[PDB]
Symmetry: C3
Amino acid sequence: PSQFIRRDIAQTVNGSLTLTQQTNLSAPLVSSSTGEFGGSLAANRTFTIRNTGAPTSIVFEKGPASGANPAQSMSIRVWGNQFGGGSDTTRSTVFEVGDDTSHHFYSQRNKDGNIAFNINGTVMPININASGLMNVNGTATFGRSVTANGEFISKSANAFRAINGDYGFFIRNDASNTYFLLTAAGDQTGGFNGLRPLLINNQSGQITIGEGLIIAKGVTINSGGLTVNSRIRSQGTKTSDLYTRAPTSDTVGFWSIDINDSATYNQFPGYFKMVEKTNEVTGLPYLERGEEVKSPGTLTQFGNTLDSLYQDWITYPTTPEARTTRWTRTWQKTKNSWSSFVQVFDGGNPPQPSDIGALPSDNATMGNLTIRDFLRIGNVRIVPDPVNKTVKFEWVE
Amino acid sequence: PSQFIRRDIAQTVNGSLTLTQQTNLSAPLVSSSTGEFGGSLAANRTFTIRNTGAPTSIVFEKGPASGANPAQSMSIRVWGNQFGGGSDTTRSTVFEVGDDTSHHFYSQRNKDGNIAFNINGTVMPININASGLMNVNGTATFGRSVTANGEFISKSANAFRAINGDYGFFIRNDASNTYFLLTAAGDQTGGFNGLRPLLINNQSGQITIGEGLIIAKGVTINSGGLTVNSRIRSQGTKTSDLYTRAPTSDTVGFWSIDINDSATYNQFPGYFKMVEKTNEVTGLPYLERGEEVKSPGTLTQFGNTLDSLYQDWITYPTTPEARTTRWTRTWQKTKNSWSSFVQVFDGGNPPQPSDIGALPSDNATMGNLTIRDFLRIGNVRIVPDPVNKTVKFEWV
Amino acid sequence: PSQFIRRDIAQTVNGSLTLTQQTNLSAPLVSSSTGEFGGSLAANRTFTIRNTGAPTSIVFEKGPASGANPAQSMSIRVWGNQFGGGSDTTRSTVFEVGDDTSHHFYSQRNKDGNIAFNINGTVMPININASGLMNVNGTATFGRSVTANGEFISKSANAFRAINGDYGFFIRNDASNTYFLLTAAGDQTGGFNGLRPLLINNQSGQITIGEGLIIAKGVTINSGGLTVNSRIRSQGTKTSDLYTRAPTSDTVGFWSIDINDSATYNQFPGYFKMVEKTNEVTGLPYLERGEEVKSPGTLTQFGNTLDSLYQDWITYPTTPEARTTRWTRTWQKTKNSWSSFVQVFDGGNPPQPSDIGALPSDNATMGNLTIRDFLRIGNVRIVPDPVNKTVKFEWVE
């Protein structure tokens, strides 16, 4: 009648067909319902998951817990919240991959049009090459060098540290001063010890070096002077020829030298032996200069130029009866020579009557003497007697 | 004939069927055409998108703009340009994910066989662990420490900066000199102010410290000497026992001490009062020594060693008629003592006849004198007369 | 009869049907077998790949090597090894994308529940924003500034380097000392040259500056003193008023000045041209002062305070007959004046009899003299003759 199906015209089948043989189609299959295949599936070029009100997804089933199967099912879901009316409408288009516990990753176009790729864990690339910015909130470690075309800036008080062997060296800006500091040995990442090698006042720029300073190749203080607690050893260059050496631009200035070798000090002036004499009349001692004796001594130079330069020589005693005598000379640029050392006159080295043209206090001899008022010999006074053009001899008493 | 579908052998059906009940299959479905399901679809194990000349893709539709739908449709496409597509041939195999506007990301293998994973925006992981290298073209910020097993190199003139509080401190290599510099207060990322704490010349390595230098625990200049503009205060260690103090390795050298306290300066030589007298005969004045007067003074030492060491003591006046006198002594290592201070003779402090063994210029007494030529008394010469065995007198 | 298909009840079919027109479904399609579509395919909302023991995948075919086709096929596979009984069972759930040669990338959740996203090559984002840690094993390069809230630490002996123009400057902790060093010109990334600008001893903190030091705005040594090899030029500030200038807190201390200009040196003491006289009886010479002659000289100051301050003036000869004479003075704080310069007495500049109140040895005149024992004139001794209350004459031969 029409309870059987036609091969030639359109037809509506109201019984469930089971097809036990291969079904072939050469025209569109259009269903308003589901498809289920117990074997594999293939289609040409494009698979489209259609959306009529809910986000689209692919589900990868986990299957039995055996072989190469995963522990959880996963999905790809394409969704957003721009149209959902929540407190957040900024997740405009999201491609999210995850399992039953949480997403693994997603890409997202924000409502602002920018794209994010979120990874819910650790990203493990080989190389990284980012065209834009980097931020990293946690600790960072690099296995090799780090080069920047810009500046390195630290907001940590301990800012820059170099660790090698037993010690950390570091630069610390504590807001008041910037310090160059060192760790205890074996505490290389830790705090500063008690050493204060160098600091810089952040306000004034003034530097304090706290554990001693050695300088090679000269020092010049341009301004402000120098204060020293509590001695200066200005050590002159000691040469065999100090007695005759012309100064140079390198040897001008202040220094002292200990001339302690006889080959040198024998060329220099000595001390003088002194004999303590007694004035017969008054009993007061006076020193009579005796023989010169060569001695070690200190040579001290002063003055800063090849014109302005002088020296002092101060003998020091090394034998039990040795005395000390000082001597002076001045550099004579126009003569290209040192003046001859002259003796300083002092209470240990007094000028002698013959040095100055003074009559000795006793046992004296002279060419001539003029007496205006009287000469007394023993108890006789000799006085002028001009009225008789002679002298009177007055026995006293 | 029969135009009815045989239930028993192979049948080509040439009208459109419309199946209202569940359709079961137990053998392959094989179509040369499209499929469209208005409900969900499932398959076992594997889904293959066949490629007969155009790249394969999955399209995820956006649907109506409501609920949890995305604003744009997305696609996964597997494509390349090694065999076509304009000028680039190096993108061999690309797995691209994106929306109607642009890709979000892709992986590719290039023609040389290397893999890139491109993200068209911000990658936001928790941790990063890269086995190879890193390049970042833009500014970088780190929330905690940054440790490198290698060196940190900056190609920026301002190279390394430590900011804390009001100030940035920084090292600047300007190509000529390397400077340690400071910002103005509250300009911590900015340029250097006028301070010049320290620079190093890049050619000579000579250092200039520009805002003063304090040093503790000693200074030694190994070579090249020292030049100072424009004074040196070498301040000796003032102790109560300076008069008797033996030098030590610490106190040898040059210094000066102001001995201003009588407890100490009373131990040292004073100045001498002096009275100007006039020689009656010549009219020429001379200074006659009187009482010693204790006085503050400057003690200055010279010499660098326990052998080579001497001192000067220069009194300074603190009362209106006070004079000034210098005194000297030498350290005597072998006797373990300072020599006694001796007075310096100078124009303000001349020797006296008593110091030198000389007769005073008048009112004098002596034991004996010998006169070779003549003794004149008033206007009479007393001379010897051999032809008489005595003296003779001669007027004028 | 039942050689045709019934159109109104359930019908098992055992022929192979070939449908040449569009097939329309309005109820589920349920197959135990495969599906293959030579055109495109679409479903609504969800696609599920079922798993009955082997991991699920999608395969994207490369097709012919033409147009916009890829060089290799790709797949997405969701798989694991937790259940496989192998030596690694930690890869619990893996979402893996790759081609015929290898994976490109994968996400996984491990057995510990943590997520990794592995990229088998170079990750190329625009920006990076990591909420956790960063480790990079290879070389790192940064195009702009690098700012850390924490400390920068290097474990490299050469730790921090600033390159500009021809030179690298760097800080090197070699485990013994920390050095500030410089490259040769044009070797900006290389080793140190021979320069030693600054180093810090890691154990003591002592600093050595090796290529000279200039300091401006003053130096103070708080402790430990100063040693200088091998001279000190303490250069006083030379003003026109040095003769009368009161000291100030800036000018106290030790210095020397070369007073080489007559406008200034004519205000200071001169030297004396000396005149040699000869004792008539001994033939021994003695010097006395001739004319004073103004001269350039060295002015040297000593002392540290406005109380404790003195000066020396040492003339230097600039002509044949010129001689060096020294002069001294003391700052008198309570009088607010320098003492008058007084002449130093020395061998070149001895005191005269008239300076000391001594009788001249030659050609002397005095008011009175008392002789106790004898006066001899030529060959006659005049002696006290107390027995005859006079004086006795005694010719001596």
